[PDB]
Symmetry: C2
Subunit: 113 residues, 2 copies
Amino acid sequence: DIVMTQSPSSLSVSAGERVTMSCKSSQSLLYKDGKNFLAWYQQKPGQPPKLLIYGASTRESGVPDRFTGSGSGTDFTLTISSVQAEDLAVYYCQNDHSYPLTFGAGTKLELKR
Amino acid sequence: DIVMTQSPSSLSVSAGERVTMSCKSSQSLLYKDGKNFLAWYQQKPGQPPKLLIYGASTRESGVPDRFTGSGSGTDFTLTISSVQAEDLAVYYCQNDHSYPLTFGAGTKLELKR
């Protein structure tokens, strides 16, 4: 199996500020076409996961530009440039093409008052 | 988008007994080869989702036979024939081939003392 290592496990930030979170895979996710088979999901409290990004950096429809996914091969990043109250959630990265498909353990993002 | 309707939302059962939970998709998931593009994930408390079944009824490696997925087209079922303490989790079904990929809202399974 492909192990996805996420960090940090949790962070606390005030609104409007930048955060970065890391996801490393134990195997390369990069394919022939320059394509990285890596998704990011957001799971708000009491809700199912929702696909935010696939292909390492393509945002889904409706996902704001304050989310950016980057990186390639094994080392990926999700940055939120200005965190807002509705971004409170657990973020997971996933190996989404090589079975069994595997999530990392998540980064919990909490808002500071 | 494909909407996945799960029911029931929660249930409480004693160990060793049978439970069934339903997942309906608003569009047919059945493809040309007899193939249904439907996965079930299990999410234990504080953990990421883990893929249990894909193709509507193929169990992943290591998943015990007391899990069975069935159904076709729009109407799917996950049955656990003898629920054990480690099956405590939220179960999600997912449209896993038609983007954006979509989870249902989950069935929370809780053990009765």
